[PDB]
Amino acid sequence: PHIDIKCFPRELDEQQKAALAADITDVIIRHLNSKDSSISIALQQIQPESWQAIWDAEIAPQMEALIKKPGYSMNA
Amino acid sequence: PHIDIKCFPRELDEQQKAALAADITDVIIRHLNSKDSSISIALQQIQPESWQAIWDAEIAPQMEALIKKPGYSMNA
Numbered sequence: 569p570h571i572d573i574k575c576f577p578r579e580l581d582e583q584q585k586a587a588l589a590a591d592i593t594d595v596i597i598r599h600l601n602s603k604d605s606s607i608s609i610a611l612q613q614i615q616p617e618s619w620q621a622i623w624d625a626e627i628a629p630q631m632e633a634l635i636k637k638p639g640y641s642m643n644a
Numbered sequence: 645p646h647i648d649i650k651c652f653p654r655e656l657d658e659q660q661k662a663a664l665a666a667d668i669t670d671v672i673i674r675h676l677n678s679k680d681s682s683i684s685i686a687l688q689q690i691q692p693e694s695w696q697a698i699w700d701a702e703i704a705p706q707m708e709a710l711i712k713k714p715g716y717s718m719n720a
């Protein structure tokens with residue numbers, strides 16, 4: 569599986585990115601019956617002013633199918 | 645944060661989807677210091693014949709930047 573994480577900017581060093589990836593990996597292995605070798609993970613830091621584009625392209629159109637819906641709304 | 649999970653087709657029921665979302669949520673809360681309300685999660689099933697397009701758009705061009713690189717390769 570390929571996991572993409574989008575978030576607002578924060579200071580995250582390589583040890584912190586690796587620890588995040590490890591914990592995501594364990595969850596994916598246990599829930600999707602995956603193998604470590606099949607898992608890839610991207611982390612993309614998006615400035616808050618550009619979050620509306622993520623809402624419009626990714627979040628809102630998929631509201632009917634999201635496995636976890638946001639606790640906020642940004643329809644413009 | 646917005647998390648997108650792309651994987652091959654699988655039978656997943658409502659309880660399974662919600663448990664996967666909750667384990668992902670807690671990992672994001674731990675590593676990104678996020679609030680529950682800011683987290684959204686998508687699960688997109690991709691047919692195996694369409695995985696090369698995911699590799700070409702999301703994995704290969706971002707290879708060095710990935711926080712977890714794939715153990716497999718589509719360019720051997």
Ligand SMILES: O=C([O-])/C(F)=C\c1ccc(O)cc1
Nearest residue numbers: 574575576640645646678682
């Ligand atoms: O959590 C994040 O870093 C983010 F990308 C977006 C977000 C969305 C809604 C909020 O209330 C807070 C942050």
Ligand SMILES: O=C([O-])/C(F)=C\c1ccc(O)cc1
Nearest residue numbers: 569570602606650651652716
């Ligand atoms: O894990 C998945 O469900 C997937 F979308 C692709 C994949 C990639 C490499 C593998 O070895 C197995 C599956």
